[PDB]
Design a protein around this ligand. Structure first.
Ligand code: FJT
Ligand code: FJT
Ligand code: FJT
Ligand code: FJT
Ligand code: FJT
Ligand code: FJT
Ligand code: FJT
Ligand code: FJT
Ligand code: FJT
Ligand code: FJT
Lengths: 166, 166, 166, 167, 167, 164, 166, 166, 169, 165
């Protein structure tokens, strides 16, 4: 009996490792499943990812917003690139992080020059929406190759609570 | 059934081999499971690791502090780099080691220079917290490429009991 | 069921092939398992190994000494490097070998120079402890790139009985 | 069920392909298993091997002699190097071969010194001479020739007892 | 159930793809099984093989001759080198072939000496002549030609008995 | 000596194949070389490239503009991506092409920097073809090749020659 | 003649492609050569590099400063990472750049955490010395994953003149 | 050829890792220059992270054997056996450029445990001889995984002069 | 020209690196070269080898003994396996070693041989060692059994080399 | 090049495995030395474990073709086709160093008959130059073993075993 099954029975979705179309398919499938069991019971999303494909990450993001369930996000280990975007996409008041985690919002098929900027500005708006920061701040922050502490990411607007014990 | 399914039925979590994001996910999943069965019954963590990814180790570490269960750590074979951190992070009075084990605290997507130091100082504080040593002592020891014996590591504050037989 | 799953029901643990951190984890779990069913019924350890990782072998060794069960060791095929150490680590009077086996005690993550030298003396003492020989004999014997016959290794203190038929 | 479990349910042990420590562990486990089911019912060992690791073969050899069961050896396809040694190690009167099988006794894990390889060679010399009832000098001179023997040829030599076309 | 499991319930053994010691072990194991179910009920051998190891092919051949069951051979797609030898080794009157199949008897373990390759070649010469009822002069001269035969050609030669478009 | 040296002795620089930092080093070295022998005699640049590294091409481009020699560009086979940029960067009135060639200006680091390079290419094309920025941007958006006469009617090259 | 045997006759040293220990030896040898021909005639260093090994760059830098010749640096194509350091290390008034070149000072054998910061602070001081900026400005500037235009680098102090034509 | 002219000025380049292939070349050039003049000094430019010990000791023994004075120059870095060759220069003629990195901590065929300590103890004596420090000081220093600045190595006794300009 | 073409003008043959049929061919060619030019001037052999193919080493050994020149051997860095055999095969009184070298005579465990033909080769190595070190066969057999290196002074007292030099007097 | 000076002394090196690539060079050097003088002898140094049969027979026939006397020298080892070239020297001029190893056992894709045709061709060539019977050669070549230089001299493969000149 897979341990990841008894995790699903507790409404926990693990987003660990890089994010590609294969990972997104599972996460989205698990999210739509838990919604059918209850569109009211909250869902916990554990994040330990260095990023991945943007479209695959945006696929999870729109799915997190589409469903009606509240989503508790937990940053474990690290949440970088698209991983921090999913972290900030949690239900307001339910975005958590463990004390020694690291948060990074800087960005490290084949597309055109105008297309990467379309996605980049598309990322600017999503961050500003959930962190309630200005577009100019997000641009300057994502330009810095740096990690943030859980307390730093709380001051930036990415997460709400840093917990040592429940 | 499978021997690894029986260790879990006996509240034993194996942290053996190198540590990456994949290993940490299992350990954290196994840790959260045993807590649900009982937030009072202790958990046994067997460690035979040469280290691994820092964020993955801090992920397990933060989870060890998060849960309420007492955690008995056992160094078998060796516990080096992030492995020694998990060993010293056990519940005080329950950090064990077998007689012929070796303990090493020296540290061997990329990051910037200012970021790895944010992690070393993050490791300095965690060691000093559980070994009850000064930051200068932890820093000075970690500068030496060396292993410690169970009795050597016991005086330093890494483990509490050295057992040949119970 | 599986032939190796039926061996476990007969208290037989197979240490064949090279020894690494993966082998030690499996063997230790089986040893801890058989002890739980009965701390009095003996355990049989079949050895056909050319050696392996030192720390992984010492992990099995400390577990062999830790538990209360008597351990019958059987040298089948060959027991070289760390393999002979586990063979000699059996309960006195229960160290066997088949007639055409070869026994070798000579030794063929990165460590420093002092630490591998710390490990050989760690091997010297364990051999000298179980063969009742002097350290000078063990040091001089391990200097010879050579194999011993089962009766020769019995003369040396590595095993007690050489059996052709039961 | 699995055919190899049906073979095991009929006391048949398959020694096919090269021999390494991985093969020997299974064969020894299957032999110790069948002895527990019955130390009196014979065991059938089918051999189609070109040889393999010497220490792994001697593990099977010592195990074949250790147990109390009679062991019927059947050479199908070929038995070379350690395979013929396991073939000749059967219970006298129970060493078989099929008509088109190929028998070879000439020899072609970790490294070894020179003295150890000659130790292993003389260890092979003694085992053959014991079961073929030939002299050691004959075995040494025969093993010097890079050659195969026919099933009938090996019967005159003492490696196998019966060459069967039909039962 | 696996289609290869249901095939066995109808006494069909599939010899398809190249022939090695691994393939021979399966075929021999399945053949011994069906004999236990019935030493009288026939066995069906479907062949779509380009050849393979000689000793592995001889292993199946000797096993086909050893057992008592009648064996129906079917050439499907192609049967070349050792594959055609097993095709001709069927029970007389039970060797079939489909219309668009192709049969080849021309030839393309450890490293073998020169005298050993001829001993295997002469071993193949005799097996063909026994089952095709042809002379050695015909077999050797035919095997010298790098060529395929039609099912009707191979029937005139003695390799198979029936060429069927429909049953 | 080497046939490519007797080409150099006649003021011919070959830019054929993809463009990397290695190609630019040779072209820049050969361009600086021919200028010393004579800052007035023109230089002939044969181009058969599908593109390459942007920075290496701009290195060649900036050097073509830097030197005082007139630059005759020749599109033979094809000139795509950065190759067409070097083709249009020739001295006005000296940009040639053979009849069966094909010219491509569509283009196959951080997002803000990839965009900085694209807009940087827009200006270089518009400068040498004398077309509007919207025209260059809209043209470079189409994944397609142009005929030698089309590239003349666009400002990329001046003459299409069958025989000298 | 060979063009590379002719660049040297004009006191031109090419620093193009990535920088490793092999490139530095060639560059250093050619620099030491040109000084012997004349310790007064200037040397021209063309730079088209995306960076490389830090120690290899410092080898060229110390050699550029050691020799007595004036050094004219030319940024053609790009000068990133260690390339921008060599560009700014030219003789004041002799650091050039072509109009479409791009300059990057952000930085994209194994070392320890304390040692990578020593190299970073070592890069901070070399940049600050030649650009006449504060250490605080350099640290924040090198933190931005971005390239600079030739005019930007002229204001920041990396180069002195931007030439379209001589 | 620049490498033919380097030799014409009595300069021997030891750059990159050190193997038997490098040592043979270096030894040949050293033996060559001694015949040209047993009095004219030889200049050794070193940019190495270390390598095989026996090859380094081969160069060391050859450097000491000949009668010529030997000027050593640390350029870029001199670590492991490279620093040993650096300190093996003629006293008063061991230089280093300001941004170099000197390391004395240690990271052809397999060797036994006793025969790595004999090499390690062999390195201790050579360092103490050429640095004029005690063996106890050298041993404790070589245990620290860290680099020294040229001025630090000047204070430690590895080199004599740190020059920015001559 | 090449620096290796300048050692040759000074009668120096480099046996540096592992030994295969390719290395032996050069050494054999270089050795016959220096003897034909002069059968009286000595030849200097610098050795920095961990061993190699046995037959290739015996090719150098038989060639070293065949020619008339005295041969000065130099152990630099290390001389292990077949390297020490060529080192000990130098003309008596002309076998050198630098102070930090490491000499090994234990053999580590171009075609594949049979079991009987490896003992024919080991005994072939035993006799050559005992001949040049003037130790007993029982000592050489027992010595080559120890997986160990010798110091130049250790290897001198054993009979492998004659002089340990820091500087030439 | 040292190998160019070797040719100036009429020495041809047959070292390493034998393939069509090695044979072409050796034959060219042999054809070269005959043009220089069909009377001055040629020295063939052999340190080979064998190789392709057709390449060896190509070298062998050329050794027999030319009129020059050919001195063969076994250094290190001469196995498979290497021993054939060793015995193919002019009688009385086939030498060997003391520690050399001689092996006569033979350890594109060809058919069984053509492979058996090649062995019998090797049987006859050995018997011709060693002056032995086919029965002796077949039985000797059947043993996977090496011979000493004195052993091979008693067999007829070489003439002199030299320690010093
Ligand atoms: O019926 C639907 N859900 C109920 C459901 C029930 C049980 C599940 C399940 C889903 O998943 C496994 O167990 C549904 N149908 N269409 C959508 C919209 C949609 C939204 C996001 C996305 F990525 C893809 C889609 Cl299609 O929802
Ligand atoms: O304990 C929790 N649920 C009970 C439970 C959890 C997992 C289980 C289980 C029962 O039975 C088998 O598996 C829980 N509450 N919030 C979270 C999110 C989270 C994820 C990772 C992490 F490091 C820290 C946190 Cl807080 O988990
Ligand atoms: O109750 C214990 N065992 C009983 C047991 C029962 C069933 C098992 C089993 C073990 O293993 C599979 O099935 C126990 N006591 N101490 C520990 C910690 C420990 C000690 C030594 C060591 F090498 C590793 C570890 Cl984790 O565990
Ligand atoms: O316990 C034995 N039989 C009972 C048995 C029952 C079920 C089995 C089995 C064995 O094996 C599979 O399932 C036994 N028989 N002989 C020995 C000595 C021995 C010899 C060689 C070796 F490698 C290991 C050993 Cl223990 O033990
Ligand atoms: O008829 C037989 N019934 C026993 C049997 C029953 C069920 C089986 C089986 C075997 O195998 C799986 O299912 C039989 N078995 N073996 C032989 C002789 C033989 C022939 C060829 C060979 F390579 C090896 C041998 Cl031992 O006869
Ligand atoms: O010295 C120059 N010419 C002499 C010369 C002579 C022979 C050559 C050669 C050059 O090249 C091979 O053969 C020179 N002319 N302009 C510059 C500035 C410059 C501009 C761009 C650039 F990428 C590099 C530089 Cl240095 O320098
Ligand atoms: O001979 C020297 N100069 C003249 C010279 C002439 C021709 C050259 C040459 C050098 O090099 C190619 O052709 C010299 N001797 N010592 C130094 C100090 C030094 C400084 C930095 C460095 F990395 C290495 C060293 Cl050695 O310079
Ligand atoms: O005969 C010699 N003439 C000098 C010389 C040497 C090499 C040359 C050269 C001139 O010109 C180009 O190359 C000679 N010098 N040293 C030795 C012995 C020796 C061998 C190896 C070693 F590491 C140390 C030493 Cl001392 O002999
Ligand atoms: O012709 C000989 N010398 C002349 C000569 C001249 C210049 C050389 C050379 C040789 O070598 C390159 O430069 C010669 N002297 N002895 C032999 C017998 C021999 C012994 C061993 C061996 F491996 C090969 C042979 Cl041929 O031949
Ligand atoms: O001396 C001959 N030509 C002149 C010559 C001169 C120098 C050479 C050479 C050839 O070759 C390089 O150096 C010669 N003698 N016989 C033949 C015919 C022949 C014989 C055997 C063979 F395999 C191939 C051929 Cl073509 O030609």
């Amino acid at each position: 009996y897979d341990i990841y099954s008894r995790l699903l029975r507790e409404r926990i979705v693990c987003v660990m490792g890089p994010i590609d179309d294969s990972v997104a398919s599972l996460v989205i499938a698990q999210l739509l499943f838990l919604q059918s069991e209850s569109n009211k019971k909250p869902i916990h999303m554990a994040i330990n990812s260095p990023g991945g494909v943007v479209t695959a990450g945006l696929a999870i993001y729109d799915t997190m917003q589409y469903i009606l369930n509240p989503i508790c996000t937990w940053c474990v280990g690290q949440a970088a690139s698209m991983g921090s975007l999913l972290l900030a996409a949690g239900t307001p008041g339910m975005r958590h992080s463990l004390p020694n985690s690291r948060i990074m919002i800087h960005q490290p098929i084949a597309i055109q020059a105008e297309e990467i900027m379309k996605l980049k500005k598309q990322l600017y708006n999503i961050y500003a929406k959930h962190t309630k920061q200005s577009l100019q701040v997000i641009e300057s922050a994502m330009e810095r190759d740096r990690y943030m502490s859980p307390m730093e990411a709380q001051e930036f607007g990415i997460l709400d609570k840093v917990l040592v014990h429940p």
